Amino acid sequence: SSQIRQNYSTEVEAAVNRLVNLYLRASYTYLSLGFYFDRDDVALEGVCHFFRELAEEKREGAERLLKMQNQRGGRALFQDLQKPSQDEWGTTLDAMKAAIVLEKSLNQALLDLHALGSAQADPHLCDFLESHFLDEEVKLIKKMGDHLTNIQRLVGSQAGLGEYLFERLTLK
Amino acid sequence: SSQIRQNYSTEVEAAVNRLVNLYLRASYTYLSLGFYFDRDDVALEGVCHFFRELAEEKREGAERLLKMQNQRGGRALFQDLQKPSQDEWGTTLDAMKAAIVLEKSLNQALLDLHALGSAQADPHLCDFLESHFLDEEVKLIKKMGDHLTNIQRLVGSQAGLGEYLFERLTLK
Amino acid sequence: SSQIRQNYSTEVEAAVNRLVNLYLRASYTYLSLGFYFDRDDVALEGVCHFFRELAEEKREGAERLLKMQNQRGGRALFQDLQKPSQDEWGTTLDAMKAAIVLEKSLNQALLDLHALGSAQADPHLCDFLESHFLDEEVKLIKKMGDHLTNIQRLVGSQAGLGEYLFERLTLK
Amino acid sequence: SSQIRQNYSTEVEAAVNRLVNLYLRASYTYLSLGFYFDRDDVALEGVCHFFRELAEEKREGAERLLKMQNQRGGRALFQDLQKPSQDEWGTTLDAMKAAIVLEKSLNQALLDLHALGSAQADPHLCDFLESHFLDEEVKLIKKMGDHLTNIQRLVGSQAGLGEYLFERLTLK
Numbered sequence A, B, C, D: 001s002s003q004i005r006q007n008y009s010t011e012v013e014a015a016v017n018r019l020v021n022l023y024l025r026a027s028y029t030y031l032s033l034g035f036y037f038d039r040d041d042v043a044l045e046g047v048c049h050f051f052r053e054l055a056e057e058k059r060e061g062a063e064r065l066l067k068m069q070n071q072r073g074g075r076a077l078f079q080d081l082q083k084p085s086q087d088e089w090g091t092t093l094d095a096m097k098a099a100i101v102l103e104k105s106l107n108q109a110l111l112d113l114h115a116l117g118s119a120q121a122d123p124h125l126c127d128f129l130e131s132h133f134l135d136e137e138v139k140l141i142k143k144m145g146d147h148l149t150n151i152q153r154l155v156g157s158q159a160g161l162g163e164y165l166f167e168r169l170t171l172k
């Protein structure tokens, strides 16, 4: 039961629980990415650290969503967290591409919940999404895009040298 | 007259004046609640202090609304402030229930003004409401709900002991 | 590939990957426990905070295991993380019981990996387990047991009062 | 004579003296490696410094073993220290390979002494080895492996440029 729930639809409550699963799944993905780049046969620390910090951001995102769910009187429901899509992530370029795909899917999920909030006339939700999630995703996606462009420029015909340099001088 | 008013309907101007009266009425209510719990025959300081701090928050809310009304070129109009609904407020449980009812009515009023702002295409209003009022009401209502649950748990068959303990260890 | 792997069996590598899943599953469980006690209709902050800090410990445990897997030249493999066993966790007593059951299962898993390490003559593993996991589990299980005894003592015929007091004065 | 020796076999005493020779031999090897990279015609300072710091670690390892030998009532016996395997060490890649081979041989020696300690039921020995030597060797071997992977990536078709960059940006 709740004695506080007001203007908080069951449709929004469910979408929020699905978004928590997506953020947690994203955190798991980034955990796998991070550790992949710490393999002795991959050994790009800067990449490890970039992805591990993203794991932590996505976990924090889920936690903020859960706290908001309780603030509105909604009920957290957790599902299975699906294993990441790959067991090995190839090059930094391959990984950065996979990260951007992931983030775009999270952003589209937030866009979808915002739409549903407008359709439900729930301005607290739409406010919460904007401040804490939408702006963050846009900034993060721009940083990833910038990274991908710099990695692409560095491939050329010297791909090993380029992957080292990016790691040392960007991820730095 | 005003030389600044832009995109600010007479309907929003009136709703803002009604919301100022509701916040001020709420502040008055909480003043009465606070002093009730300072009666020698009630004597729960922690409760006094909880309600008096809410009186101050609601007054500040009204003041922020009034400042915003002038910022938009609207004209403050004050009405009679109706005396609080009760002269004595019973137990902490009764009081916390009355507070939650009050806050929910304020929240619904803010929701109503937001709706009217969307219908009027006034995004400054909808922004102002979100940041300074809607998030605050959700947090406050959750805290009140948490309090009510803890008070309810403490009643049991030892209601005096429970009311003391909550006051001492929560309101603390 | 690895150029470093030495004295590190495929059986230990797999058991380490299973233990990472168990620690992560435990972290997820504790996340669900934490948020349950932050429901407005449960509202025991101290319990929220106890379980959330355990979520963080178990995540750190998994991370340490993953770092060790790479240090030995083993390859992380992630599986589905199964949703926690319950969606609502009942009383603090019920929850503390569930936590102790969980921790005992983790401890038995560590015991099992240690046995396998002896059978494999892998003293680095057995060392790593002892310092970072076995001592920690024993201390944590003793704290949980102490908590359970104090909760049990407090039930009596005044269960609500007892649950409040434990939260306020132990979890404090 | 000794008035303190307890549970300390002559087989362990001899293995400890052989391990001291191996650590000292390793220290000598790293001294030769360090100075090779300070030749005017090699001139990679970062490599000099990496190997010289390893010379010092291995000397400290031997000293700790000797102190432990006396702590148990065993008697240090020193042998000839064989000259390093090469007089010139080729590229950083060649050197890092030789270092990893060396470290793996030290690790296997520690593994062998641990086995012998279990067979002798000497838990102090097995404890001493773990804390001060086994964990250190695993960390060092992982760092070397990481280095070798980065050097390999940098060779490509620009081996001089790659060797400079690694020295400047990793060994740094």
Ligand SMILES: [Ir+3]
Pocket (backbone or CB within 6 Å): A049
């Ligand atoms: Ir950092």
Ligand SMILES: [Ir+3]
Pocket (backbone or CB within 6 Å): A049
């Ligand atoms: Ir950082």
Ligand SMILES: [Ir+3]
Pocket (backbone or CB within 6 Å): A049, A053
């Ligand atoms: Ir960082």
Ligand SMILES: [Ir+3]
Pocket (backbone or CB within 6 Å): A114, A117, A118, A126
């Ligand atoms: Ir919106």
Ligand SMILES: [Ir+3]
Pocket (backbone or CB within 6 Å): A068, A127, A128, A132
């Ligand atoms: Ir929020």
Ligand SMILES: [Ir+3]
Pocket (backbone or CB within 6 Å): B049
């Ligand atoms: Ir105060």
Ligand SMILES: [Ir+3]
Pocket (backbone or CB within 6 Å): B049
């Ligand atoms: Ir205060």
Ligand SMILES: [Ir+3]
Pocket (backbone or CB within 6 Å): B049, B053
């Ligand atoms: Ir106060």
Ligand SMILES: [Ir+3]
Pocket (backbone or CB within 6 Å): A123, B114, B117, B118, B126
């Ligand atoms: Ir709006």
Ligand SMILES: [Ir+3]
Pocket (backbone or CB within 6 Å): B068, B127, B128, B132
């Ligand atoms: Ir404003």
Ligand SMILES: [Ir+3]
Pocket (backbone or CB within 6 Å): C049
């Ligand atoms: Ir804390």
Ligand SMILES: [Ir+3]
Pocket (backbone or CB within 6 Å): C049
């Ligand atoms: Ir704490």
Ligand SMILES: [Ir+3]
Pocket (backbone or CB within 6 Å): C049, C053
């Ligand atoms: Ir804490």
Ligand SMILES: [Ir+3]
Pocket (backbone or CB within 6 Å): C114, C117, C118, C126
């Ligand atoms: Ir063991």
Ligand SMILES: [Ir+3]
Pocket (backbone or CB within 6 Å): C068, C127, C128, C132
């Ligand atoms: Ir370890």
Ligand SMILES: [Ir+3]
Pocket (backbone or CB within 6 Å): D049
């Ligand atoms: Ir130095």
